[PDB]
Amino acid sequence: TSPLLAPVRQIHAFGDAYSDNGESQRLTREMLAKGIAGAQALPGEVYWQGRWSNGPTAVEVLARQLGAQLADHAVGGAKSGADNYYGWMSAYRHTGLAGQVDAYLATLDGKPVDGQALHFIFVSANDFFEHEDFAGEQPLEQLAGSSVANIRAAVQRLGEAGARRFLVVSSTDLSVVPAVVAGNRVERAQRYLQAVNASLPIQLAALRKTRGLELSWFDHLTFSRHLRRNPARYGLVELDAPCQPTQPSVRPACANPDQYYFWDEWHPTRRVHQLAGEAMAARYAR
């Protein structure tokens, strides 16, 4: 190990349902009130306080561990570019990573970026899910290259505006997601996530060096592989079945959710989010 990075007192989080701590719920409630075409209530009835899980997301645990306030801009469905898996949001708000970056910068209205705040980025899953669900054109190698470029551009744009500290999360292991397994798409997920995770850290290391940034890379795939190889160590028992099935329809939730890896068919449980948050916090002093 090298020296721990300096303490963190403010996080700005950008990303998708792996981080969202209430934004998709707030926005969809707004959209429903306004009669927006296509709007639906997200995340749904079988979720904890608007999180796409049964508890806090990894970034919420990271903030708790580190003693930081959290401004969590992440939106369930968010892609790495401007928009969302949920196409019907585009007309109302651009909620992808690039959209969230634009909205954060516009809220600053010329005032300075907090150079001490950690800019946490965790996105790309929906790039893959939209591509598979709506038969996207690109070869997965090209889709991964677009994901990588999008995330690099978000770091560059935040740095441009004055951000100095970043934590960028890798692709998760999409290959073990229950919906991917049920779609017989394990190899395509493997190929997509390997491409993102090989390229992105090399691009971010160059950007870090050029702009004098503090940028930490969190390898979520290494993290999940280690958990899923040694589950008993962490008190996990069921790695594959969702605790709270939703497809084809909502069924009764499992008795022992802290023994389950997956909450629904796409999203991990509060236990896994806890472990992930603790792992992410390990690079920083309290």
Cα angle value 266/17/216 (rounded, 5°): 110
Interface characters, 206-245, with ligand AT3 (x: CB under 6 A): ----------------------------------------
The distance of closest approach from Cβ of residue 203 to ligand AT3 in the complex, given in angstroms and rounded to an integer, is: 25
- Dmax over CA atoms of the chain, in Å, equals 53
Dihedrals phi, psi of 48, to nearest 5 degrees:
-95, 115
Cβ proximity to ligand AT3: between 77 and 277 the closer is: 77
The least distance separating ligand AT3 from the CB of residue 6, rounded to whole angstroms, comes to 34
Collapsed DSSP state (helix, strand, coil) of residue 179 = helix
- Gap between the Cα atoms of 260 and 270, Å rounded: 9
Find the shortest distance in angstroms from Cβ 132 to ligand AT3: 9
Closest by CA position to 280, among listed 72, 19, 51, 74: 19
Min dist. Cβ of residue 246 to ligand AT3 (A): 6
Among 14, 55, 68, 85, binds ligand AT3 (CB under 6 A): 85
Q: Which of residues 260-279 bind ligand AT3 (CB under 6 A)?
A: 264, 266
Q: Other CB atoms closer than 10 Å to residue 256's CB: what's the count?
A: 11
Closest CA to 146 of 131, 161, 160, 167: 131
Give the nearer residue to ligand AT3 in terms of CB position, either 65 or 246.
246
Find the shortest distance in angstroms from Cβ 279 to ligand AT3: 22
d(CA 116, CA 166): 10
> In this complex, which beta carbon is closest to ligand AT3, that of residue 60 or of residue 130?
130
Size of the site for ligand AT3 (CB under 6 A): 7
User: Least CB distance from residue 196 to ligand AT3, whole Å?
Assistant: 17
Nearer to ligand AT3, 65 or 224 (CB): 224
Give 192 or 284: the residue with its C-beta nearer to ligand AT3.
192
Degrees, nearest 5: CA angle 101-62-163 = 35
Contact 14, 101 (CB under 8 A): yes
Q: Does 126 bind ligand AT3 (CB under 6 A)?
A: yes
Beta bridge partners of 167: 120, 216
Residues that bind ligand AT3 (CB under 6 A): 77, 85, 126, 129, 246, 264, 266
